[PDB]
Design a protein around this ligand. Sequence first.
Ligand code: NAG
Lengths: 27, 41
Amino acid sequence: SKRSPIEDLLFNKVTLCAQKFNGLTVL
Amino acid sequence: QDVNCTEVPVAWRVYSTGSNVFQTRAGCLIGAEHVNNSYEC
Ligand SMILES: *[C@@H]1O[C@H](CO)[C@@H](O)[C@H](O)[C@H]1NC(C)=O
């Protein structure tokens, strides 16, 4: 990864399906 | 959009298959060639 240690720590804490159905799309 | 396009021609026709076909994250694009360079957007 091209991130920094602080960026890596940030991206590992945001972590908390819904692929597609009934015309629901995510761009 | 959001369609693996080995199976587009299932539904004025050159843009359904043939020529050159490209796979992007949003979907896939038909009618354009994928170069190996980089330019301004
Ligand atoms: C698209 O379909 C082809 C054959 O049907 C398969 O080889 C390929 O892995 C598929 N790609 C995706 C992203 O599903």
